UniProtKB/Swiss-Prot annotation, chains A, B:
Its EC number is 4.2.1.33, 4.2.1.35, 4.2.1.31. This is Isopropylmalate/citramalate isomerase small subunit. GO terms for molecular function: (R)-2-methylmalate dehydratase activity; 3-isopropylmalate dehydratase activity; maleate hydratase activity. Optimum pH is 7.5.
Amino acid sequence: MRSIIKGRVWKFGNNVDTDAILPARYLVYTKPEELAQFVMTGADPDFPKKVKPGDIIVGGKNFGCGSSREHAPLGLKGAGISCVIAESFARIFYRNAINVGLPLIECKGISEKVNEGDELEVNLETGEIKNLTTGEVLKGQKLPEFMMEILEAGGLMPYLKKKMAESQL
Amino acid sequence: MRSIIKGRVWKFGNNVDTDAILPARYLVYTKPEELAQFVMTGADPDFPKKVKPGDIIVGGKNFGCGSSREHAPLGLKGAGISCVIAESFARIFYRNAINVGLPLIECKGISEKVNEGDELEVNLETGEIKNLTTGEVLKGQKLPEFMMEILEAGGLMPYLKKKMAESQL
């Protein structure tokens, strides 16, 4: 589980909905490997041609808004997106993402301080964000240790297996 | 569940271990109603005679330290402890507590700004803590909305129940 993430940024704006992230026509697919091929194609039909595993997505307010669509974060995960940093996240998208093991970070003002193509360093444990391209540094909201453990585990289900293997009732 | 908890404080010190919280001789019990009767009896054998449901526990550093003992936060929960606020918590206790629906908040310096018997108002969502009998306002670490959801569900199992009940895949 890399606590500290360095990657180049793909940028998206406000109210980017689950249709932008994973179009309805791909709901036929349930595997992350399949879904990875179609990430963000609602917003940019060529996106899967540009993105590389390890890249970071930066979004505006209310990223992932819309009704539940687990395929959306599952696809980002499958594509190797290292994390998503946004001004804010829709609530359903947010929990779905943490539970599939996709790190998310809220950072007010991120939209003003990062450009598409910039290189970022993100410390998940502290929320500190460094724009390497520009030298600017920001303070996002850290992931608490409790949530780092879920992420480190790979998501909720593998998290559960570990917790149950260690129980005693 | 309340975003805001108000309660009178019971105070304990540093490195309060799982034996202080729920002594080993009580491991024979698995129900919260039973364990409730013996909360904190390692540190204060009369504690169950004083504590009332809704009361808050304030702890020093490394509260809940020791090997995994699920009974310890289960007993606190069973006793109706509304919240535990500490300078810091042991990792294992911390996850065991959140996973049985027991709200925890970390607040550096809480030990010096609260007396036993003081009345506190704790905002779980922002982490802001008002010492009502003192007027002082302290800043604890907020529980992220993701964890608020687990607590609002009553713990990990009831959370999982609803999450699969809401699943598409």
